Amino acid sequence: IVGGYTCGANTVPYQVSLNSGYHFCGGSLINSQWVVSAAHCYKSGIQVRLGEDNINVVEGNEQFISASKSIVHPSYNSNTLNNDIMLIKLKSAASLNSRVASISLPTSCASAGTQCLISGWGNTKSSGTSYPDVLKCLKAPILSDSSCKSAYPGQITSNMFCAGYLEGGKDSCQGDSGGPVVCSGKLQGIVSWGSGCAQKNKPGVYTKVCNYVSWIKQTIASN
Numbered sequence: 514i515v516g517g518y519t520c521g522a523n524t525v526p527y528q529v530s531l532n533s534g535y536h537f538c539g540g541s542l543i544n545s546q547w548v549v550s551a552a553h554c555y556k557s558g559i560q561v562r563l564g565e566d567n568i569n570v571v572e573g574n575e576q577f578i579s580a581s582k583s584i585v586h587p588s589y590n591s592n593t594l595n596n597d598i599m600l601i602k603l604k605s606a607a608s609l610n611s612r613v614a615s616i617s618l619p620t621s622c623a624s625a626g627t628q629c630l631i632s633g634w635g636n637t638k639s640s641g642t643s644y645p646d647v648l649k650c651l652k653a654p655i656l657s658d659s660s661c662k663s664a665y666p667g668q669i670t671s672n673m674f675c676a677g678y679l680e681g682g683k684d685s686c687q688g689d690s691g692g693p694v695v696c697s698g699k700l701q702g703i704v705s706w707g708s709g710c711a712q713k714n715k716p717g718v719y720t721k722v723c724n725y726v727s728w729i730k731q732t733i734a735s736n
């Protein structure tokens with residue numbers, strides 16, 4: 514997260530870190546046994562880390578649970594990033610409490626103008642690299658489809674939305690992928706892609722979660 518702020522320990526209780534020996538992506542806990550992330554975060558041997566603030570220090574509220582299965586969206590295209598969504602099932606149910614909590618799926622798609630909270634442990638620099646150890650946060654509005662498409666000609670599908678600031682300086686970034694965009698207490702987006710990070714006229718592009726609620730529910734019901 515570039516140009517954000519320190520969230521505060523366990524203030525984003527649905528935020529998970531995906532770990533394969535090291536943090537590599539974010540995710541969102543949507544019930545005691547399932548995490549939503551980005552398909553481009555797929556790999557084998559994932560350990561889900563809940564209750565995390567400093568990802569390099571055991572602070573006392575962590576739950577580390579290996580994934581039993583991952584399900585990449587059936588129509589995920591890695592070239593265009595269309596349908597950049599996957600589900601990860603935990604081998605055991607997490608223990609839910611105030612610091613480790615699921616986030617609700619949307620009942621309705623969020624509109625341009627709605628303020629959301631974006632969070633992650635990704636790069637905090639637009640130029641060069643610095644990874645924070647604690648969770649970073651950014652409040653950002655959903656942008657209009659027209660401004661999104663104008664910013665990225667020929668690249669924005671009906672399964673994507675832009676959020677952030679056209680002026681630049683405030684954005685998600687590498688390492689934030691798969692993490693949440695939460696608006697009015699609902700998971701509306703997944704950190705997906707963008708040109709660099711926090712660049713002028715290159716806002717963040719996010720998977721449009723509301724399009725996937727049926728697939729998510731049906732997938733969970735049978736797996």
Ligand SMILES: NC(=[NH2+])c1ccc(N)cc1
Nearest residue numbers: 685686706707709710717
């Ligand atoms: N929002 C962004 N600029 C972004 C997010 C993730 C990513 N992998 C690349 C760029």
Ligand SMILES: [Ca+2]
Nearest residue numbers: 567570571572
């Ligand atoms: Ca920790």
